[PDB]
Design a protein around this ligand. Structure first.
Ligand code: NA
Lengths: 519, 514
């Protein structure tokens, strides 16, 4: 999809003012809200929490939330419910769940509006979207899932929520409702075929084939023979640290009458992997009939060769240091300080951006690159270089023994006075060239200002590493000297049409990002 | 009717909670509320005012009322605006909505009352002639879902549907009440009344109209009225002038009423108040009217004779001998067996009353005590002067209550027996002459002239002293009285002395027959 740390969807409340009544309020893709990056995934997402904090109540002011979440800033009663897939409960990077208030009714006759029922959100959010994943093998992920429905006059979902308060009619059915009383979430022990407590998810992720399948079920209250009910299966393709696909409603029958909301397929399943090697994931979807939205989370068993799916780095000038950036496997979306900066609105480019550090100044290259972006980033005053690209699958690395790549680079170097040079297509300005022997796992090339650097390295999988050096001789602006500069890079896009890398040093310094295109 | 100083009727608000909705709330005779005696007729009636004071608001706490009432529209019949005894009108609040969702009650709209009240209900009226009364009238309707009265009230706020149509509504915008001058054929401003009272024939007729805003005849008539006068009261019907024929009826005045009732107030009934409820229970009306701004007959006697100070006060009465009105409260004299005795506490602590007699129907008299004060009382409904019989020899027999003393006091209740208090009278109507005797122990002698339905003369202990079981010498004591009931079957009088022996006496006798 379009990437992000998380998504939230608000409960609906239907207007029943007589004469001005909405017979229905459907859910919409436009209803999804970004959560932003959480400092602590176990806490509620801050933007949406603030909204609910301001929601008026009249008798019970508490915020109720999923049992494994941090009550934080909020209270409860008659409470020890559980919602967990057994053996898969120790989430560290990703949380999904719900939170809500018993909101006061809106009783605004003078605006012909009457609304009543809970107000709240379902959501998932995560930190540390993954830059590496297992290289191969099928891996079981389990966790939880949550839902919120549309509202329609006369509608009920009595199979999942006892409809004494018009759940599904006046306000959304949702998995946190006080009348969701048919799961085993309050029971003290499990039946031998339960996957856990409440609504749980089970996914099989095939890292070898870049795809996944799964099942979303309810673990049923024991009030012979089977004690779970399946509402969806899932199917998705993995691209980098993201996945996209479909959800299939398990019981839609034909003839109905359909006492639950899970009756339509979804063509908008999307999620992503989080953690050092994608050991946790978050996902969401919206049903095609706009009657239900789902979010969820899953993880490998509570306590392997890896492949790198992306590079995203920031090189800070002042201290020549190199930090990893978050990225959602999208070279054209620059993620810094938890905000997303697009990189496409003519070689290179330049612009500034302010969200909602004051503003970000970015110079990005290049116009002919599609899986790789690099340039200059400045906060306001801080200055850095950056590079980010989507690695080519190691199994797609071409075998060709002679391959030339051409492009440019941004440079900042000094043994005394400093030299800085942007990237360019012309003329004697920064230019880069590389010859790669894939068969040999060998790579070499040169960067020239017009004087030059010379790079050499070997090829490990879908990335390379080596060293860069001035002529020394020396450089320009009066001379700078570089020797044994630590060089890191990778190949980007299908069959490695693109490649790029960077180096920092380490009385001469140096920080360089470069990217080249295949001929 | 059943008499009173005034009546009020509250606006209705209809429950429109979905699923627990009232489709309609009709008016009912039982909805009428007594107002009590006002100290100042220009002020709002106190009981109902207190109710409205407690009505909850949320944004506008004011009480709005008819412009001539004591807190630039006008509501008045020109030349007939200076009311002193009787006021009718309305008052209300922009009441907050009731929004009780868990008990399934939603109500919205104005809350308030229409009312009339008066002081000094009349004991005399003009003896004859037709007299024009004009004034104002007011209405409140039922509520019914989907109902509007757009001819009278612009229905932007569901007037007639969620809360009663009423003449004080802010959207009553079709009368001339806000205009600065009058058309040639307007009777005045807003909704006005015009009555012709025929005191000669004891009846009245009238018309209730709206004076229309000018933006072709300028008034619209909604009712005519017809009533019979009995004493200081009147009862009859209202006839809806436009009912239902070729029209779908854009106003609430579509049904007749068989419950028009009202009464006269002031020294000679120069003002009146009235009310009615439509037979279809869709609309209640109250109103008031007066003779133009600036010989009598007496229709009732109602007096209190205070012992301690031998003084005699007029009581209010609504032309009903069996309803004793003291201190603004109504005390019935027949239990819904000669003489009677009982006590009564309203809502002075309690009233103790001894009343006579069981055979009298237009005349009641006896003892009244407050708690401690003690008085005698007499009240009766005079016979029409034109019904005074011409018979030259007529005997009346009965009793009397007596309290007298030149030294020690003598008190004697009334009775049928035996040597106890007894009264006898012979009346020569042809001669306009009356005489009779009261005896305790076998004594007062009374001569008097008849005038209309009343008499006036003297009572003397004669010669000399009386008993005191010490001689009490009362002579030339003024005696006043009347003939009560149709054709003067019952008669009554009283006397106070002086105008070392005192005396206060009420008596009543009944007519005999060959
Ligand atoms: Na986000």
């Amino acid at each position: 999809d379009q990437g992000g740390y998380g998504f939230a969807m608000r409960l609906k409340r239907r207007n029943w003012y007589p004469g001005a009544e909405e017979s229905e309020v459907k859910l919409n893709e436009s209803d999804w809200e970004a959560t932003g990056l959480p400092t602590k995934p176990k806490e509620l997402p801050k933007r949406q929490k603030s909204v609910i904090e301001k929601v008026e109540t009249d008798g019970d002011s508490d915020i109720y939330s999923s049992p494994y979440l941090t009550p934080s800033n909020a209270g409860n009663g008659v409470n020890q419910p559980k919602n967990q897939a057994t053996g898969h409960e120790n989430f560290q990077y990703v949380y999904s769940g719900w939170f809500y208030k018993h909101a006061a009714s809106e009783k605004d006759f003078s605006n012909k509006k009457i609304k009543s029922g809970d107000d709240g959100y379902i959501f998932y959010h995560g930190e540390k979207p993954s830059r590496q994943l297992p290289a191969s093998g099928k891996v079981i992920y389990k966790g939880v899932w949550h839902f919120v429905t549309d509202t329609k006059k006369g509608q009920d979902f009595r199979e999942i929520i006892q409809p004494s308060k018009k759940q599904g009619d006046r306000y959304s059915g949702f998995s946190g409702d006080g009348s969701e009383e048919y799961s085993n979430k309050n029971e003290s022990t499990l039946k031998d075929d339960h996957e856990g407590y409440g609504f749980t998810s089970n996914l099989e992720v095939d890292f070898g084939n870049k795809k996944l399948t799964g099942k979303l079920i309810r673990n049923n209250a024991s009030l012979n023979d089977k004690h779970t009910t399946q509402y969806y299966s899932l199917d998705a393709q993995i691209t980098g640290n993201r996945f996209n696909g479909t959800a299939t409603a398990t019981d839609k029958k034909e003839n109905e009458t359909k006492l639950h909301p899970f009756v339509s397929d979804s063509s908008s399943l999307s999620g992503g992997f989080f953690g050092p090697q994608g050991e946790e994931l978050g996902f969401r979807f919206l049903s095609d009939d706009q009657k239900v939205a789902v979010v969820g989370s899953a993880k490998t068993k509570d306590k392997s060769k890896l492949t790198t799916v992306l590079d995203a780095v920031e090189l800070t000038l002042n201290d020549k240091k190199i930090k990893n950036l978050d990225n959602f496997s999208n070279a054209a979306q620059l993620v810094v300080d938890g905000i997303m900066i697009p990189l496409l609105p003519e070689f290179t480019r330049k612009f500034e951006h302010t969200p909602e550090t004051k503003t970000y100044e970015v110079e990005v290259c290049c116009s002919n690159l599609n899986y790789l972006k690099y340039g200059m980033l400045t906060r306001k005053v801080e200055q850095s270089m950056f590079l980010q690209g989507e690695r080519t699958d190691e199994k797609e690395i071409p075998t060709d023994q002679n391959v030339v790549y051409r492009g440019s680079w941004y440079g900042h170097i000094a043994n005394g006075t400093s030299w800085s040079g942007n990237a360019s297509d012309k003329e004697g300005g920064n230019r880069a060239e590389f010859t790669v022997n894939f068969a040999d796992k060998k790579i070499t090339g040169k960067l020239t200002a017009e004087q030059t650097f010379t790079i050499e390295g070997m090829i490990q999988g879908n990335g390379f590493e080596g060293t860069a050096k001035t002529a020394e001789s020396g450089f320009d602006l009066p001379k700078a000297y570089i020797t044994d500069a630590k060089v890191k890079g990778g190949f980007y896009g299908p069959k490695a049409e693109e490649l790029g890398g960077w180096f920092a040093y380490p009385a001469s310094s140096a920080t360089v990002v470069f990217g080249a295109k295949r001929q």
